Design an enzyme around this catalytic site. Sequence first.
Site, PDB file in Angstrom:
ATOM      1  N   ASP A  35      -1.134  -4.715   5.858  1.00  0.00           N
ATOM      2  CA  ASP A  35      -1.630  -3.334   5.966  1.00  0.00           C
ATOM      3  C   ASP A  35      -1.072  -2.621   7.199  1.00  0.00           C
ATOM      4  O   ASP A  35      -1.566  -2.826   8.315  1.00  0.00           O
ATOM      5  CB  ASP A  35      -3.166  -3.312   6.006  1.00  0.00           C
ATOM      6  CG  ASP A  35      -3.733  -1.879   6.017  1.00  0.00           C
ATOM      7  OD1 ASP A  35      -3.081  -0.971   5.454  1.00  0.00           O
ATOM      8  OD2 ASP A  35      -4.808  -1.657   6.602  1.00  0.00           O
ATOM      9  N   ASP A 217       1.920   3.719   5.015  1.00  0.00           N
ATOM     10  CA  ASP A 217       0.805   2.779   4.844  1.00  0.00           C
ATOM     11  C   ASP A 217       1.029   1.828   3.665  1.00  0.00           C
ATOM     12  O   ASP A 217       0.746   2.175   2.515  1.00  0.00           O
ATOM     13  CB  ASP A 217      -0.512   3.544   4.691  1.00  0.00           C
ATOM     14  CG  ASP A 217      -1.713   2.618   4.639  1.00  0.00           C
ATOM     15  OD1 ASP A 217      -1.535   1.393   4.812  1.00  0.00           O
ATOM     16  OD2 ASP A 217      -2.827   3.111   4.437  1.00  0.00           O
TER      17      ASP A 217
HETATM   18  C1  LIG Z   1      -8.743   7.326  -2.519  1.00  0.00           C
HETATM   19  N1  LIG Z   1      -8.425   5.953  -2.127  1.00  0.00           N
HETATM   20  C2  LIG Z   1      -9.514   4.990  -2.260  1.00  0.00           C
HETATM   21  C3  LIG Z   1      -7.191   5.639  -1.683  1.00  0.00           C
HETATM   22  O1  LIG Z   1      -6.308   6.471  -1.588  1.00  0.00           O
HETATM   23  C4  LIG Z   1      -6.906   4.226  -1.274  1.00  0.00           C
HETATM   24  C5  LIG Z   1      -6.245   3.360  -2.142  1.00  0.00           C
HETATM   25  C6  LIG Z   1      -5.953   2.070  -1.728  1.00  0.00           C
HETATM   26  C7  LIG Z   1      -6.313   1.623  -0.466  1.00  0.00           C
HETATM   27  C8  LIG Z   1      -6.952   2.492   0.413  1.00  0.00           C
HETATM   28  C9  LIG Z   1      -7.250   3.792   0.010  1.00  0.00           C
HETATM   29  C10 LIG Z   1      -7.332   2.009   1.781  1.00  0.00           C
HETATM   30  O2  LIG Z   1      -8.354   2.406   2.334  1.00  0.00           O
HETATM   31  N2  LIG Z   1      -6.474   1.152   2.368  1.00  0.00           N
HETATM   32  C11 LIG Z   1      -6.694   0.550   3.685  1.00  0.00           C
HETATM   33  C12 LIG Z   1      -5.824   1.206   4.769  1.00  0.00           C
HETATM   34  O3  LIG Z   1      -4.431   1.021   4.481  1.00  0.00           O
HETATM   35  C13 LIG Z   1      -6.128   2.692   4.845  1.00  0.00           C
HETATM   36  O4  LIG Z   1      -7.439   2.917   5.408  1.00  0.00           O
HETATM   37  C14 LIG Z   1      -6.412  -0.964   3.592  1.00  0.00           C
HETATM   38  C15 LIG Z   1      -7.170  -1.612   2.456  1.00  0.00           C
HETATM   39  C16 LIG Z   1      -8.539  -1.810   2.544  1.00  0.00           C
HETATM   40  C17 LIG Z   1      -9.243  -2.397   1.505  1.00  0.00           C
HETATM   41  C18 LIG Z   1      -8.591  -2.800   0.353  1.00  0.00           C
HETATM   42  C19 LIG Z   1      -7.226  -2.602   0.252  1.00  0.00           C
HETATM   43  C20 LIG Z   1      -6.511  -2.008   1.292  1.00  0.00           C
HETATM   44  O5  LIG Z   1      -6.696  -3.032  -0.931  1.00  0.00           O
HETATM   45  C21 LIG Z   1      -5.277  -2.954  -1.119  1.00  0.00           C
HETATM   46  C22 LIG Z   1      -5.063  -2.515  -2.543  1.00  0.00           C
HETATM   47  C23 LIG Z   1      -4.672  -1.063  -2.678  1.00  0.00           C
HETATM   48  C24 LIG Z   1      -5.829  -0.133  -2.711  1.00  0.00           C
HETATM   49  O6  LIG Z   1      -5.304   1.210  -2.576  1.00  0.00           O
END
Ligand SMILES: CN(C)C(=O)c1cc2cc(c1)C(=O)N[C@H]([C@@H](O)CO)Cc1cccc(c1)OCCCCO2
Length: 367
Positions: A35, A217
């Site tokens: 990440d 990101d």
């Molecule tokens: C509207 N919406 C919910 C989004 O646009 C979105 C989509 C997404 C991850 C985030 C946000 C997210 O918050 N990403 C985080 C940090 O990069 C940024 O703050 C890191 C993170 C945290 C939890 C699970 C994760 C990743 O799963 C990775 C799989 C991909 C998921 O896609």
Amino acid sequence: SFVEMVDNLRGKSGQGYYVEMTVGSPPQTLNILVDTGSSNFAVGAAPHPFLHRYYQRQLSSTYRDLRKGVYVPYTQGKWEGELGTDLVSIPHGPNVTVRANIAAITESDKFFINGSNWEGILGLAYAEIARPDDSLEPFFDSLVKQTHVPNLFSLQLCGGGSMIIGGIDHSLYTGSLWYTPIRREWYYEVIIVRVEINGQDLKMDCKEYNYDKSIVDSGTTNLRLPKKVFEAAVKSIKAASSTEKFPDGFWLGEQLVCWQAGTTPWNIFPVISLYLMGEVTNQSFRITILPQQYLRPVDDCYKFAISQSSTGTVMGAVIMEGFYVVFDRARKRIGFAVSACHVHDEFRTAAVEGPFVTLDMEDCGYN
Ligand SMILES: CN(C)C(=O)c1cc2cc(c1)C(=O)N[C@H]([C@@H](O)CO)Cc1cccc(c1)OCCCCO2
């Protein structure tokens, strides 16, 4: 020595890319989400329905408790846990062991993903956005401090992939690397200076492209755009594809769209060019995104992987896929090149091209 790290990532844009790591003595093996959008290293450390394994601090003789709590919110999901340190290695990374800060995750909400195959997160951004504050040293900072690993890493995400820790593997990309300044060391913040769709300038004040920031990101799936930019882009993409009509929820990322296997009408969807601030005065370069990147496969069915944001532009995994991205922390810049695992259209190709002249690029940053 980088061949050992080629292909050390697994996963996809939708559920994240992860690298194998071990924590503790004796080493406990865990898959760790890569990440660049956060700065905490944290691992599941209590049972959870979606975790098949977790960090067991009682089994590690090198574990040290820091006697402090921590919570980290993300755009999607959040967790809270207990801080400590332990020894950490990356089996398909550099041959080193470092004592790193680790958040032992004890409670979480919509953070772990069912069937993702990862159990923790490696935040690769800077201390300025670390929780609880910037005195908690991020993993990559500890790695560079304690070893001779050079202060840079690169990501080749393939839509598997590679995280080259400590350098650049030239066998993973073609053509030239083009560099954009890291505007500020918190997120990997960059400045977008121009946007074109099928060669047509969106002609918005370039501040709109970076309102209120633009970041790279690997932990976000979509290309996320500020509301005003999102509306302009959707209107233009709708116009280019008006040959066919799509449910109004397709453009919101809710409904998928399907076509008879092998008949996806790629040519009706435009290419998107993002111009980034360059390294010399009045110079930019562009990266060009094909529809095969922003129509995420899920007949052949797809979700629209461009979505709206209220926290600035996010160049997520679908943008990074097909490019080789160098996070050159030592020189405060991010490099882009066409990846060896690039997107294949028949008449079009993803590209990194320059130089371009762009005046007043500093005005494009938001304050
Ligand atoms: C509207 N919406 C919910 C989004 O646009 C979105 C989509 C997404 C991850 C985030 C946000 C997210 O918050 N990403 C985080 C940090 O990069 C940024 O703050 C890191 C993170 C945290 C939890 C699970 C994760 C990743 O799963 C990775 C799989 C991909 C998921 O896609």
